């Protein structure tokens, strides 16, 4: 871990690892927690494989839409998910940024969730902090746990 | 996958060498330092961690003695079949510091040797044009050096 370029977040969710994994990889679920309200997701496309596209359209409270395009780098079922915005579909360099590493670990009561956002420079890391990374990402995880608990039965 | 003629450059060549040797040439630092760059250019140092997320590091040097460090990251490693690396990311999939490209190399054994197919993916047409021009003022030359080097292996 590089304190100069990376930001980390660790949380404990009272949900099984299999369910958490589905929440992180299924568009139908992603669009319900991936962004912190009042923000929302207008579209989400997922090709879950290395080199596969991770596309999402975020809408802010002002009504502005922001199409996001990323690429999956590692997909280790119920263990590790890595995607980057530095590359798009088929590993193509993105048009001129972060790489997210999500690690899961089952526990006696649920799943240990660890998220790390990797940046290219200290300035970008600092910028993400001033962008509300800790609060924002923290809120999304809370929304995730809330979603899985109520959709658990189904 | 089909290349994008506007952003991608392709190189196809037949090497009269067995696939196992071509693979060694593409992955062993000792060999890479003897063909990867067109002379008078040279490589004074090379590091390869051959795995997805592994660093691909090289130090380009001129007859003057000036060094030029270059860092990349491997994305896919399929033994003697396909190799993918990118300069848009560095070690451990970290976004690179702001010619960015992603290289896709595929090998196919033939009766006489190995079919070498490599593609350089760019982010924009402008970058593609700049790479192709500068390259011509090389990609093909390095391959010739590779074949000659591998012929000395025995």
DSSP state of A94: P
Contact between residue B119 and residue B12 where contact means Cβ atoms under 8 Å apart: no
Across the strands, what pairs with B95? B89
Q: Count CB neighbours of A72 within 10 A.
A: 22
Contact between residue B6 and residue B125 where contact means Cβ atoms under 8 Å apart: yes
How many beta-carbon pairs below 8 A join chains A and B? 79
Query: CA nearest B104 in A: which residue?
Result: A91
- Shortest Cα distance from A146 to chain B (angstroms)? 31
Distances from the Cα of A75 to the Cαs of A49, A88, B65, in angstroms?
6, 16, 43
Q: Count CB neighbours of A42 within 10 A.
A: 12
How far apart (Å, rounded) are the C-alpha atoms in residues B1 and A47?
14
Buried b (16+ CB within 10 A) or exposed e, B91-100: bebbbbeeeb
Which residues, in sequence order, are CB contacts of B145 under 8 Å at separation 6+? B34, B35, B38, B39
- Shortest Cα distance from B114 to chain A (angstroms)? 24
Contact between residue A32 and residue A148 where contact means Cβ atoms under 8 Å apart: no
How far apart (Å, rounded) are the C-alpha atoms in residues B85 and A53?
17
Positive or negative, the CA dihedral A12, A13, A16, A22 is negative
How far apart (Å, rounded) are the C-alpha atoms in residues B72 and B90?
5
Q: Count CB neighbours of B145 within 10 A.
A: 16
Residue A128 half-sphere exposure toward CB, CA atoms < 13 A? 22
How far apart (Å, rounded) are the C-alpha atoms in residues B25 and B80?
11
Chain A contact probe: residue of B95, B99, B131 with most A CBs at under 10 A? B95
Strand order in the sheet with A53-59: A6-13, A111-118, A99-106, A80-84, A65-76, A53-59, A40-46
Contact A92 B84 (CB under 8 A): no
Distances from the Cα of B120 to the Cαs of A121, B55, B103, in angstroms?
25, 18, 5
* Degrees to nearest 5, angle at CA B73 with B69 and B79: 125
> Which among A51, A94, A99 has CB closest to B123?
A94
- Is A51 in CB contact (< 8 Å) with chain B? yes
Helix, strand and coil percent figures for chain B, each rounded to 5: 25, 40, 35
* Residue B108 parent element (H or E): strand B102-109
The CATH code of the domain at B1-154 is 3.30.530.20
Residue B141 half-sphere exposure toward CB, CA atoms < 13 A? 9
* Degrees to nearest 5, angle at CA A117 with A115 and A120: 160
* Closest among A134, A12, A17 to A80, alpha carbons compared: A17
How far apart (Å, rounded) are the C-alpha atoms in residues B8 and A143?
41
Which residues, in sequence order, are CB contacts of B111 under 8 Å at separation 6+? none
How far apart (Å, rounded) are the C-alpha atoms in residues B51 and A72?
16
Across the strands, what pairs with A105? A112
Pairing status of strand B114-121 against strand A6-13: unpaired
Contact between residue A80 and residue A71 where contact means Cβ atoms under 8 Å apart: no
> Which among B93, B100, B124 has CB closest to A118?
B93
Contact between residue A81 and residue A69 where contact means Cβ atoms under 8 Å apart: no
Sequential DSSP letters for B83-106: EEEESSEEGGGEEPP----EEEEE
How far apart (Å, rounded) are the C-alpha atoms in residues A44 and A93?
20
- Shortest Cα distance from B74 to chain A (angstroms)? 10
Domain positions in chain A are 1-154
* Closest among B61, B139, B66, B64 to B99, alpha carbons compared: B139
Q: Is B6 exposed, middle or buried (0-12, 13-18, 19+ CB in 10 A)?
A: exposed
How far apart (Å, rounded) are the C-alpha atoms in residues A21 and A77?
7
The answer for B36, left when phi > 0, alpha when psi is -120 to 50, beta otherwise, is alpha
Contact B92 A50 (CB under 8 A): no
- Of chain B, the end-to-end C-alpha distance in Å amounts to 35
How far apart (Å, rounded) are the C-alpha atoms in residues A65 and A60?
7
- Shortest Cα distance from B121 to chain A (angstroms)? 6
- Of chain A, the end-to-end C-alpha distance in Å amounts to 38
Contact between residue B121 and residue A93 where contact means Cβ atoms under 8 Å apart: yes
Which residues, in sequence order, are CB contacts of B127 under 8 Å at separation 6+? B7, B99, B100, B101
Contact between residue A34 and residue A41 where contact means Cβ atoms under 8 Å apart: yes
Q: Count CB neighbours of B138 within 10 A.
A: 13
Across the strands, what pairs with A55? A45, A69
């Amino acid at each position: 871990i590089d304190a100069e370029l990376d930001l980390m977040l660790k949380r404990e969710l009272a949900v099984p690892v299999n369910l958490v994994w589905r929440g992180l990889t299924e568009p139908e679920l992603l669009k319900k927690w991936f962004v912190p309200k009042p923000w929302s997701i207008s579209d989400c496309r997922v090709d879950l494989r290395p080199g596969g596209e991770f596309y999402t359209v975020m809408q802010d409270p002002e009504g502005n839409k922001f199409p996001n395009s990323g690429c999956f780098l590692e997909v280790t079922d119920e263990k590790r998910l890595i995607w980057t915005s530095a590359l798009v579909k088929n590993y193509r360099p993105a048009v001129p940024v972060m790489t997210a590493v999500i690690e899961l670990q089952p526990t006696s009561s649920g799943t240990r969730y660890t998220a790390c956002a990797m940046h290219n420079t200290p300035g970008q890391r600092k910028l993400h902090e001033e962008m509300g990374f800790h609060e924002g990402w923290g809120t999304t995880i809370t929304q995730l746990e809330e979603l899985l608990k109520q959709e658990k039965a189904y």
